[PDB]
Structure 1
């Protein structure tokens, strides 16, 4: 209650909606284009990078395990990120300087599960595909 209701008050109603629309969080990040600027990916879906070293990451408080992440430097703009290697015993397939391909966890810029500070996962290594190697459908080229 308290809106202008007259027949010639179309200017105030249109102006008010424009100003208060910024209080929304989903719309505010769309208008300013933060993804184009701050996100390591240039607003894209995938990216290619070079593996630097293998790192183990501890799980959060209730759990206890080693998550076995990896360090990657992006070819497109030279930034450095960390990515998670899914499935059981798959670090064995990746070596140093292996040209991996990455994607997201699907939480749209937030960490998934108990893994802290990790936002990406490895999809392909040496252009073969990680899951295909796991089921012994293909052999990794030398």
Structure 2
């Protein structure tokens, strides 16, 4: 099967390090690009000022107006 060495820990460590970048969950916590694009700088809440009140429609199977605001 895979490598079974007793002196092959270097190969197994390199394999796991390279392949750990392939899951979106683990990559999001070690890459710093998400925080910059996130309007909250990694914070639970944030404070803002209301600009205007808008009404956005609902997606296709539904039908309504969702009463949002621009902040």
Q: Which TM-score band (shorter chain)?
A: over 0.9
Post-superposition shift, 1:36?
2.1
CA RMSD of the aligned region, Å?
Answer: 0.9
Deviations 1:49-81 (A, max 9, x none): 000000000001011111010000xxxxxxxxx
Considering fraction of residues, name the structure with more strand.
1
Moved over 4 A (4+): none
- Matched residues in 2 for 1:60 and 1:71: separation? 19
TM-score, normalising length: structure 2? 0.94
Deviations 1:11-69 (A, max 9, x none): 00001000000001100111102332110000000000000000000001011111010
Ranges in structure 2 where 5+ consecutive residues have no aligned partner: none
TM-score, normalising length: structure 1? 0.48
